[PDB]
From a paper:
In the classical nucleocytoplasmic transport pathway, the nuclear import receptor importin-α (IMPα) recognises a nuclear localisation signal ([name]) displayed on a cargo protein, and this dimer, through interaction with importin-β (IMPβ), is docked and translocated across the nuclear pore complex through interaction with nucleoporins. IMPα, a large (529 residue) highly conserved macromolecule, is composed of 2 structural domains, a short basic 10 kDa N-terminal domain that binds importin-β (IBB domain), and a 50 kDa armadillo (ARM)-repeat [name] binding domain that recognises and binds NLSs of various cargo proteins. Specifically, the nucleotide bound state of Ran results in conformational changes in two surface loops of the protein, termed switch I and switch II, which in turn mediates its ability to dissociate importin:cargo complexes in the GTP-bound form. This is achieved through the asymmetric distribution of Ran regulatory proteins across the nuclear envelope, which modulate the nucleotide bound state of Ran; Ran guanidine exchange factor (RCC1/[name]), predominately localised to the nucleus, maintains Ran in a GTP bound form that binds IMPs with high affinity and dissociates the complex upon nuclear entry; whilst RanGTPase activating protein (RanGAP), cytoplasmically located, maintains Ran in a GDP bound conformation. Here, using x-ray crystallography, we elucidate the binding interface between IMPα and the [name] region of [name], and provide a structural comparison to other known IMPα:[name] cargo interaction interfaces.
Using amino acid substitutions, the [name] was shown to be bipartite, consisting of residues KR4, a 12-residue spacer, and RAKKMSK23. Recombinant IMPαΔIBB (IMPα lacking the N-terminal IBB domain, thus preventing autoinhibition of the [name] binding site), consisting of 10 consecutive ARM repeat domains, was first purified by affinity and size exclusion chromatography, then applied to a column loaded with purified GST-tagged [name] [name]. A final structural model, comprised of IMPα residues 72 to 497, bound to [name] [name] residues KR4 and RAKKMSK23, and 126 water molecules, with good stereochemistry has been deposited to the PDB. Residues 6–15 of [name] could not be discerned from the electron density, a common observation for bipartite NLSs with long linker regions and these residues were omitted from the final model. The interaction between IMPα and the [name] [name] is made through an extensive array of contacts involving residues contained with ARM repeats 2 through 7, utilising both the major and minor [name] binding sites of IMPα to contact Prp20NLSRAKKMSK23 and the canonical Prp20NLSKR4 motif, respectively, and exhibiting a total of 1,091 Å2 buried surface area. One notable feature of the major site is the insertion of Prp20NLSAla18 between the P0 and P1 [name] positions, noted in only a few classical bipartite NLSs. This results in hydrogen-bonding interactions between the Prp20NLSAla18, and the side chains of Trp231 and Arg238 of IMPαΔIBB.
Author numbering:
A (entry chain A): 72 to 497
B (entry chain B): 3 to 5, 16 to 25
């Protein structure tokens, strides 16, 4: 009956003066817009149908046309920015917020979903959705004693939409919206559905991707231990955002970073730094690099947890981008560590893979490595053992690599190397 | 210190 209508038949039905004809035609639009290959979103927009769909959202007396129109609009709003905008410019935002209170769960859920698509377009629409008062009624849908009594699909949608309200930057969401959402998010993060957990992690990851005061608002809610537990989950779609959030946190103050350590994060790193997914290995190593940029007692915990050999491992063999994070981690460690910590690093075998990386054609990694080498020499000066290190560097091919880099195009590179040769190899 | 979830989703069924 409503399979494969043409756009002009949809239009004819929608402009009939007959609410049931209008319902049918709307559902026909919903089915066109639901198909996998190339839903004709532009054709429906150009036929002028958005304003009619939007007025159908307000038909309380006809729940099925509210549902079909909400579903149609959700799929228009899922497309490009220009398509999401046509939905917003039709007045959809306030009309979807009013349907959040619908007694029909499947309608309320559709409105949740549509608002998530709108907010997911970017900061401006996210902030407009917020200004129109969406957060109170979204959160009231989750004001239940036990999230387990909600339908699973519905909870997941609510979680995803909330995550889109937490998204983006330039600007980040209003501080007061973040304060209002956070307690519900903390509760979703203790829920047992893997997709709610994933999306709650994603939300927390967005909220920690910012300056220290943004990180603080999250860390103060006590979530860091739960994030560490999710870090150890078997599902990759959970570990990925949990690790992004932990990483973001450790870009903050040394005290914020200490909370991550205190909660036991370092114990999961032997597995993250060997994870078969190269993106996890990369972000794990990035995260290490920010922990090795902290204080000496923090560097010591990296040492006590047995993580220096895992950094030697990733330096020795990993995807190139992960190796570049490892080089950063080593330059940070050597720049802030004690003499003893730096010696330990050499005893773990850091020099040979560091030298092997000097033949990379990435001039950033080269500077990072030269800085590390200079720092390690500086610790050896203090013990009077620059020679022993010089020999170690020469024996694995490292002197040849540094000699060459005197003739490198970049300025800091030729300088840094000239220095080392002049200072330690003449 | 140095600084994947779909933005939008269409409903098919």
């Amino acid at each position: 009956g409503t399979v494969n209508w043409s756009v002009e038949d949809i239009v004819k039905g929608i402009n009939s003066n007959n609410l049931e004809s209008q319902l049918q035609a709307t559902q026909a639009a919903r089915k066109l817009l639901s198909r996998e290959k190339q839903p004709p979103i532009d054709n429906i927009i150009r036929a002028g149908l958005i304003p009619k769909f939007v007025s159908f959202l307000g038909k309380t007396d006809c729940s099925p046309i509210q549902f079909e129109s909400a579903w149609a609009l959700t799929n228009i709003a899922s497309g490009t920015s220009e398509q999401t905008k046509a939905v917003v410019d039709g007045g959809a935002i306030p009309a979807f917020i009013s349907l959040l209170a619908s007694p029909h769960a499947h309608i309320s859920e559709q409105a949740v979903w549509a608002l998530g698509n709108i907010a997911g377009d970017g900061s401006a629409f996210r902030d407009l959705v917020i200004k129109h008062g969406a957060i109170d009624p979204l959160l009231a849908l989750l004001a239940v004693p036990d999230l387990s009594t909600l339908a699973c699909g519905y909870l997941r949608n609510l979680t995803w939409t909330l995550s889109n309200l937490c998204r983006n930057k330039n600007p980040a969401p209003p501080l007061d919206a973040v304060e209002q959402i956070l307690p519900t998010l903390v509760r979703l993060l203790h829920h047992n559905d893997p997709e709610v957990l994933a999306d709650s992690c994603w939300a927390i990851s967005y909220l920690t991707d910012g300056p220290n005061e943004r990180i603080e608002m999250v860390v103060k809610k006590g979530v860091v231990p739960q994030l560490v537990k999710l870090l150890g989950a078997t599902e990759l779609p959970i570990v990925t955002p949990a690790l992004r959030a932990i990483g973001n946190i450790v870009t903050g103050t040394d005290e914020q970073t200490q909370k991550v350590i205190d909660a036991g994060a370092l114990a999961v790193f032997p597995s993250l730094l060997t994870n078969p997914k190269t993106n996890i290995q990369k972000e794990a190593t990035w995260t290490m690099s920010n922990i090795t940029a902290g204080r000496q007692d923090q560097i010591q915990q990296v040492v006590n947890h047995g993580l220096v050999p895992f950094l030697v491992g990733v330096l020795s063999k990993a995807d190139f981008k992960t190796q570049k994070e490892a080089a950063w981690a080593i330059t940070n460690y050597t720049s802030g560590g004690t003499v003893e910590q730096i010696v330990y690093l050499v005893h773990c075998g850091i020099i040979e893979p560091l030298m092997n990386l000097l033949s990379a054609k990435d001039t950033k990694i080269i500077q990072v490595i030269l800085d590390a080498i200079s720092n390690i020499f500086q610790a050896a000066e203090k013990l009077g053992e620059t020679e022993k290190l010089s020999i170690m560097i020469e024996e694995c091919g490292g002197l040849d690599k540094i000699e060459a880099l005197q003739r490198h195009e970049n300025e800091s590179v030729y300088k840094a190397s000239l220095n080392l040769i002049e200072k330690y190899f003449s | 210190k140095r600084t994947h979830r779909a933005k939008k989703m269409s409903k098919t069924h």
